[PDB]
Amino acid sequence: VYTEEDNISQLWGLYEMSREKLENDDIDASVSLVFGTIHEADRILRNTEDISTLPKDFHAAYSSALLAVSELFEIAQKRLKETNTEESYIDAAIERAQLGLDAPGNESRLFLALARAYLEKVRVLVWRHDNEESLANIPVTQLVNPYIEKAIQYLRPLAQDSTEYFDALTPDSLRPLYILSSYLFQFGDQFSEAFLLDVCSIITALWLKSVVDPNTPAYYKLIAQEAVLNNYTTFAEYYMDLLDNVDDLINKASSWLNNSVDTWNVIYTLDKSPERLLKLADIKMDLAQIVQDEASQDNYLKEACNAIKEAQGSGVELSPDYVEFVEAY
Ligand SMILES: [Cl-]
C-alpha cells in the first residue's frame, strides 16, 4: 500500500528534484517542481484523516518549497497574480515551518527549514532598510536581531554531534549561512567575543557536517570547505583589526590563520590547482605581518614566496602586487 509516510517521502522527492534541476541551471523546471511540491502538500492536507498527526517532516518540505519560490521568484512570479511578492513567500515559509513545531516526529529537517527561512527574512529586511523610506531610521540591528536570534535557536541543535547527518543538510541548503556570516561581520561590533566564537563554531560545524560522509563527492566537499576557510579567515581579520587599535589578539589571530592553512590544505588536496597557491601566500603573509618572532616571520615569508613562485611557474598570472613581493624578497 501507499502510506502517509510514503506520500511525505514522495513530497521530499519532488523538492529534491527541484534542487537537482536548479543545480543544472534549469530554473523553469525547478520552478515547476517547486509549485508541484506545494500542490502535492495541499493535496495531502485535504486527504489526511488528522492534520494534527502530519509529522514535522511534512511541514519542513512544504516550508522548503515556499522558500524556494522566493529564491526563484524572478521566474516564478510569471505564473502568479501580480499581488504576490518574494517576501510574502519567505513569510509563508516561516509560518508553514512554525506550524510544524507542534507536529509529531524528528525535528532536524524542520529546524533547518526554520533557520533557512529566518535568514532569508534577514536578508530581505536589510534590503528594505536600505530602500524603503519607512524603515530608513530604524537601526538594522534592531530590525533583524529577532530573526538572527531565531535562526541561531534552530541551528544550534543541528550543529551538535548528537544530531546525526540527514540528507536535507547539503552544502546548497546551507547557502543562507552566508547571510549570517555577513551579518556578524558587518555588525559584530555589537556582540561580545564569546557570542561570536559561539555562533561561528555553529556555522562551521554545520558546513563540516554537510559533507562528513567520506563518500561525499569532491565537488560538494569543496563548497563546504571553502565556506569554512572563509569563516576562519574572517575571524582572523576580526582579531587583526582589533590589533590595529596585545599578545592575546596576536595569539588568537594566529590560531585562526593557522586553522585557515589547515583547511586550505584540505581544499588543495581536493581540487589541486596552481592558482590556489596565491590564497596560501596571502594567509602566510598575514601570519608574517603580525608574528612577534623574527624566526617565524622569516619562515612565513619564505613559504609565501615559494607559493607565489610555484604558481607563476605553473602558468598562473601574477598581479604587480605578487610580482613585487617576490622581487623585494
Ligand atoms: Cl568524487
Swiss-Prot record:
<comment type="subunit">
    <text>Interacts with ofd1.</text>
</comment>
<keyword id="KW-0539">Nucleus</keyword>
<comment type="function">
    <text>Required for correct translation termination. Positive regulator of the stability of the N-terminal transcription factor domain (Sre1N) of sre1 which is released from the membrane and enters the nucleus to activate hypoxic gene expression. Also acts as a direct inhibitor of ofd1. Functions probably by inhibiting the ability of the ofd1 to accelerate Sre1N degradation in absence of oxygen.</text>
</comment>
<dbReference type="GO" id="GO:0071456">
    <property type="term" value="P:cellular response to hypoxia"/>
</dbReference>
<keyword id="KW-0804">Transcription</keyword>
<dbReference type="GO" id="GO:0032933">
    <property type="term" value="P:SREBP signaling pathway"/>
</dbReference>
<dbReference type="GO" id="GO:2000640">
    <property type="term" value="P:positive regulation of SREBP signaling pathway"/>
</dbReference>
<dbReference type="GO" id="GO:0004857">
    <property type="term" value="F:enzyme inhibitor activity"/>
</dbReference>
<dbReference type="GO" id="GO:0045944">
    <property type="term" value="P:positive regulation of transcription by RNA polymerase II"/>
</dbReference>
<dbReference type="GO" id="GO:0005634">
    <property type="term" value="C:nucleus"/>
</dbReference>
<keyword id="KW-0810">Translation regulation</keyword>
<dbReference type="GO" id="GO:0006417">
    <property type="term" value="P:regulation of translation"/>
</dbReference>
<dbReference type="GO" id="GO:0043169">
    <property type="term" value="F:cation binding"/>
</dbReference>
<keyword id="KW-0805">Transcription regulation</keyword>
<keyword id="KW-0963">Cytoplasm</keyword>
<dbReference type="GO" id="GO:0005829">
    <property type="term" value="C:cytosol"/>
</dbReference>
<comment type="similarity">
    <text>Belongs to the ETT1 family.</text>
</comment>
<protein>
    <recommendedName>
        <fullName>Negative regulator of ofd1</fullName>
    </recommendedName>
</protein>
